[PDB]
Scaffold this active site. Structure first.
Site, PDB file in Angstrom:
ATOM      1  N   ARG A 277     -28.399 -57.519  19.500  1.00  0.00           N
ATOM      2  CA  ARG A 277     -27.446 -57.467  20.866  1.00  0.00           C
ATOM      3  C   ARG A 277     -26.214 -56.046  20.536  1.00  0.00           C
ATOM      4  O   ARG A 277     -26.106 -55.711  21.424  1.00  0.00           O
ATOM      5  CB  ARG A 277     -26.713 -58.408  21.105  1.00  0.00           C
ATOM      6  CG  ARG A 277     -25.577 -59.066  19.992  1.00  0.00           C
ATOM      7  CD  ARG A 277     -24.671 -60.296  20.547  1.00  0.00           C
ATOM      8  NE  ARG A 277     -24.133 -60.905  19.471  1.00  0.00           N
ATOM      9  CZ  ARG A 277     -24.893 -61.612  18.605  1.00  0.00           C
ATOM     10  NH1 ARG A 277     -26.252 -62.089  18.723  1.00  0.00           N
ATOM     11  NH2 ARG A 277     -24.430 -62.218  17.395  1.00  0.00           N
ATOM     12  N   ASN A 278     -26.248 -55.886  19.278  1.00  0.00           N
ATOM     13  CA  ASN A 278     -25.221 -54.744  18.975  1.00  0.00           C
ATOM     14  C   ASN A 278     -25.853 -53.576  18.850  1.00  0.00           C
ATOM     15  O   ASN A 278     -25.098 -52.609  17.920  1.00  0.00           O
ATOM     16  CB  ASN A 278     -24.054 -55.234  17.960  1.00  0.00           C
ATOM     17  CG  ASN A 278     -23.165 -56.455  18.538  1.00  0.00           C
ATOM     18  OD1 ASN A 278     -22.722 -55.976  19.654  1.00  0.00           O
ATOM     19  ND2 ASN A 278     -22.513 -57.122  17.747  1.00  0.00           N
TER      20      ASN A 278
ATOM     21  N   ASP B  73     -20.451 -58.502  12.662  1.00  0.00           N
ATOM     22  CA  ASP B  73     -21.258 -58.965  13.956  1.00  0.00           C
ATOM     23  C   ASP B  73     -22.490 -58.326  13.911  1.00  0.00           C
ATOM     24  O   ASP B  73     -22.831 -57.795  15.119  1.00  0.00           O
ATOM     25  CB  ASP B  73     -20.437 -58.834  15.099  1.00  0.00           C
ATOM     26  CG  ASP B  73     -20.910 -59.569  16.446  1.00  0.00           C
ATOM     27  OD1 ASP B  73     -21.749 -60.609  16.035  1.00  0.00           O
ATOM     28  OD2 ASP B  73     -20.440 -59.179  17.270  1.00  0.00           O
TER      29      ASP B  73
ATOM     30  N   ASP C 262     -21.123 -51.673  18.668  1.00  0.00           N
ATOM     31  CA  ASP C 262     -20.426 -52.924  18.596  1.00  0.00           C
ATOM     32  C   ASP C 262     -19.645 -53.097  19.969  1.00  0.00           C
ATOM     33  O   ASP C 262     -18.980 -52.507  20.471  1.00  0.00           O
ATOM     34  CB  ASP C 262     -19.368 -53.093  17.545  1.00  0.00           C
ATOM     35  CG  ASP C 262     -18.773 -54.294  17.324  1.00  0.00           C
ATOM     36  OD1 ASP C 262     -19.077 -55.424  18.076  1.00  0.00           O
ATOM     37  OD2 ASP C 262     -17.928 -54.686  16.355  1.00  0.00           O
TER      38      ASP C 262
ATOM     39  N   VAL D 288     -16.464 -50.994  31.117  1.00  0.00           N
ATOM     40  CA  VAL D 288     -17.750 -49.876  30.437  1.00  0.00           C
ATOM     41  C   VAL D 288     -18.403 -49.272  31.837  1.00  0.00           C
ATOM     42  O   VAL D 288     -18.949 -50.196  32.461  1.00  0.00           O
ATOM     43  CB  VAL D 288     -18.614 -50.605  29.514  1.00  0.00           C
ATOM     44  CG1 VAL D 288     -19.374 -49.329  28.937  1.00  0.00           C
ATOM     45  CG2 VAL D 288     -17.783 -51.204  28.245  1.00  0.00           C
TER      46      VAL D 288
HETATM   47  C1  4Z5 Z   1     -26.508 -48.815  27.925  1.00  0.00           C
HETATM   48  N1  4Z5 Z   1     -26.412 -47.606  27.066  1.00  0.00           N
HETATM   49  C2  4Z5 Z   1     -25.295 -47.469  26.374  1.00  0.00           C
HETATM   50  N2  4Z5 Z   1     -25.246 -46.476  25.691  1.00  0.00           N
HETATM   51  C3  4Z5 Z   1     -24.092 -46.158  24.774  1.00  0.00           C
HETATM   52  C4  4Z5 Z   1     -22.949 -47.250  24.804  1.00  0.00           C
HETATM   53  C5  4Z5 Z   1     -21.762 -47.030  24.202  1.00  0.00           C
HETATM   54  C6  4Z5 Z   1     -20.913 -48.176  24.129  1.00  0.00           C
HETATM   55  C7  4Z5 Z   1     -19.623 -47.859  23.362  1.00  0.00           C
HETATM   56  C8  4Z5 Z   1     -19.180 -48.407  22.349  1.00  0.00           C
HETATM   57  C9  4Z5 Z   1     -17.963 -48.458  21.646  1.00  0.00           C
HETATM   58  N3  4Z5 Z   1     -17.770 -48.956  20.244  1.00  0.00           N
HETATM   59  C10 4Z5 Z   1     -18.696 -48.924  19.146  1.00  0.00           C
HETATM   60  O1  4Z5 Z   1     -19.808 -48.779  19.345  1.00  0.00           O
HETATM   61  N4  4Z5 Z   1     -18.076 -49.475  18.374  1.00  0.00           N
HETATM   62  C11 4Z5 Z   1     -18.662 -49.467  16.899  1.00  0.00           C
HETATM   63  C12 4Z5 Z   1     -18.519 -48.329  16.211  1.00  0.00           C
HETATM   64  C13 4Z5 Z   1     -19.190 -48.359  14.869  1.00  0.00           C
HETATM   65  C14 4Z5 Z   1     -20.747 -48.601  14.681  1.00  0.00           C
HETATM   66  C15 4Z5 Z   1     -19.341 -46.574  14.338  1.00  0.00           C
HETATM   67  C16 4Z5 Z   1     -18.453 -49.086  13.687  1.00  0.00           C
HETATM   68  C17 4Z5 Z   1     -17.195 -47.653  22.332  1.00  0.00           C
HETATM   69  F1  4Z5 Z   1     -15.983 -47.713  21.554  1.00  0.00           F
HETATM   70  C18 4Z5 Z   1     -17.284 -47.098  23.392  1.00  0.00           C
HETATM   71  C19 4Z5 Z   1     -18.406 -47.198  23.991  1.00  0.00           C
HETATM   72  C20 4Z5 Z   1     -18.748 -46.522  25.322  1.00  0.00           C
HETATM   73  C21 4Z5 Z   1     -21.155 -49.229  24.923  1.00  0.00           C
HETATM   74  C22 4Z5 Z   1     -20.110 -50.259  25.246  1.00  0.00           C
HETATM   75  N5  4Z5 Z   1     -22.283 -49.453  25.902  1.00  0.00           N
HETATM   76  C23 4Z5 Z   1     -22.960 -48.459  25.603  1.00  0.00           C
HETATM   77  N6  4Z5 Z   1     -24.333 -48.506  26.463  1.00  0.00           N
END
Ligand code: 4Z5
Length: 267
Positions: free
Chosen positions: A134-135, A130, A148, A24
């Protein structure tokens, strides 16, 4: 369909985490800051289905309190999921680093946002499984959005632990734990108790005690989220309604639940 982004429009800047089969990044999209999750060469069929499936769901959902998808790179490798960038990161770490810095109204506002997102997911027939601080991600307007990052015993409802029954109602149990996390500025649920000690305690009727400085109405609500009987828990609709009413009549939050001190100092 999902918005396809050309790789020439994306710049990866720094690694900020790990995916299931990839990393990521924080980056920029042609410019706006984004978060970027990759799926690197060698991924399995299952991984591909899960990766693009996640993106698909994110792209269809449209809610203030759910992470927004910018788009996907599927036609080139590595594949990428590109989302809005949330400047303050994960809620659990954020609260622990900002201990005592917010008003009760701000904290309750956070919870109302999370509840609104969860109500939307539940009614769209999505079960999180979950839900935990943290999520949850936090932006520069203090808006909390459900995300997530991939059983977490101390957040999970009894029926989900015992016989794998995950529903919106088990998510409500989890939401109760999230309420306790927010109001304690990221205290670990059940402190140093082991997973088996937690399961035993809950089965025997133990529930987490009042946080310090916690409105009575808020403690009452988290206790109802932790009813053993699934049917007796509030729905997310009920939770959103109650939190909205408390925020709109904020003197309601001035009445505090009694805090049970572990240590008493006599002067
Ligand atoms: C630190 N800030 C920040 N901002 C935004 C961020 C977004 C993500 C992110 C998160 C996910 N997945 C994700 O959020 N899945 C749950 C989606 C749902 C709530 C609609 C069911 C993803 F597929 C891709 C990314 C890049 C992550 C892993 N980390 C992030 N960190």
């Amino acid at each position: 369909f999902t918005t396809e982004i050309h790789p020439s429009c994306v710049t990866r800047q720094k690694v900020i985490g790990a995916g299931e089969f990839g990393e990521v990044y924080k980056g920029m999209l042609k410019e706006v800051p984004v978060a970027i999750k990759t799926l690197k060469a060698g991924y399995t069929e299952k991984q591909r289905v899960d990766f693009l499936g996640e993106a698909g769901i994110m792209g269809q959902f449209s809610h203030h309190n759910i992470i927004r998808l910018e788009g996907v790179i599927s036609k080139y490798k590595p594949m990428m999921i590109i989302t809005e960038y949330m400047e303050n990161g994960a809620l659990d770490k954020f609260l622990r680093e900002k201990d005592g810095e917010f008003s009760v109204l701000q904290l309750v506002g956070m919870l109302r946002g999370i509840a609104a997102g969860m109500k939307y997911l539940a009614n769209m027939n999505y079960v999180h499984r979950d839900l935990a601080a943290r999520n949850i991600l936090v932006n520069s307007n203090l808006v909390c959005k459900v995300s997530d990052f991939g059983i977490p015993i101390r957040w999970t409802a009894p029926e989900a632990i015992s016989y794998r029954k995950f529903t919106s109602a088990s998510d409500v149990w989890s939401f109760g734990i999230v309420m306790w996390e927010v109001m304690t500025y990221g205290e670990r649920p059940y402190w140093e108790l082991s997973n088996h000690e937690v399961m035993k305690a809950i089965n025997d009727g133990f529930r987490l005690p009042t946080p310090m400085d916690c409105p009575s109405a808020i403690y009452q609500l988290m206790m109802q989220c932790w009813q053993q009987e699934r049917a007796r828990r509030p729905k997310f609709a009920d939770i959103v309604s109650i939190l909205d009413k408390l925020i709109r009549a904020p003197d309601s939050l001035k009445t505090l639940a009694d805090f049970d001190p572990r240590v008493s100092i006599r002067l």
